[PDB]
Amino acid sequence: LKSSCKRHPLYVDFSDVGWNDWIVAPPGYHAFYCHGECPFPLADHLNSTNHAIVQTLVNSVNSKIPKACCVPTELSAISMLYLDENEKVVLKNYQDMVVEGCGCR
C-alpha cells in the first residue's frame, strides 16, 4: 500500500478484543485508521504542521531522519453502554474514537 496519507476502513468488534466483558453495547464500531506516505512535497490537500513540513524536507536530504507520519487529524466520539467501577451499567460518551480525517505529523 504505497498510496498517500488517507483514511482507511476499520470496524472494531469488542468481543474480538476481549472488551465484551465490560462493554454492553454496541458490539463494536467503525474506528477507521490512517495510513499512507507523507511525501515530499506535502500537497495542498494534506493537513500538515510546520514541523511536519520541516521534518519532511530533512528526510529528503538525510534518509536517516524519518518522514512525517500519517495519523488522525480529526476524530469524533461515540456513546457506549458499559459497566463502571461501582458495578452500575452506565451510558457515557467516548471521545477520540472514530477517525474522521488524516494528516501528516
Binding site: 454492553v24 453502554l81 451510558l91 460518551n93 467516548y94 471521545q95
Partner: protein
C-alpha cells in the same frame, strides 16, 4: 493504566449505534407495560419519560441559570429501551451569553436517569443510567 478507553462527561449523549434485528429486539410477549412499569417502578420519572410518543462562584451560577437555561426536547430511544421516549436537555448556544460577546452556553451539571434496556447474549430487560442535563454554564 491504559487498559481500555477513557470515557467522557461531555453531554449531550452521542446516539448509541445499533443494527436492529428481530432477535436483538423484544418480542411483544416480553413487552407487557404492566409488568414493565413494575420492573422500573420508582425509577420511572414521568417528567422525563413517556410510555407513548408525546462567593463570586454564586454570581456565575445565578447568571448562567438566567441566560443559559436548559432546553428539553423529547427524543426517541428505539425499541431496545423502555420507556421509549426520554426528554433530553441541551444548552442554548445560539446568542453569546457573556459581555463582551465571546462565551456561549455549555453544560455544567448532569443527572442520571434509570431506564430499561433489552440486551441479549439469553435476552431480557435490565436497568441502565441515562445521563441528562440539568444546568448550563456560560463558559468559553
Amino acid at each position: 493504566l491504559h487498559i481500555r478507553p477513557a470515557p467522557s462527561d461531555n453531554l449531550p449523549l452521542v446516539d448509541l449505534i445499533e443494527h436492529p434485528d428481530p432477535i436483538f429486539d423484544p418480542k411483544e410477549k416480553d413487552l407487557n407495560e404492566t409488568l414493565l412499569r413494575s420492573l422500573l417502578g420508582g425509577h420511572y420519572d414521568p417528567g422525563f419519560m413517556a410510555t407513548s410518543p408525546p462567593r463570586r462562584k454564586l454570581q456565575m451560577w445565578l447568571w448562567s441559570q438566567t441566560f443559559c437555561p436548559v432546553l428539553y426536547a423529547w427524543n426517541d430511544l428505539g425499541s431496545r429501551f423502555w420507556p421509549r421516549y426520554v426528554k433530553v436537555g441541551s444548552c442554548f448556544s445560539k446568542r453569546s451569553c457573556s459581555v463582551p460577546e465571546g462565551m456561549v452556553c455549555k453544560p455544567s451539571k448532569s443527572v442520571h436517569l434509570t431506564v430499561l434496556r433489552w440486551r441479549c447474549q439469553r435476552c431480557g430487560w435490565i436497568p441502565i443510567q441515562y445521563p441528562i442535563i440539568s444546568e448550563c454554564k456560560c463558559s468559553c
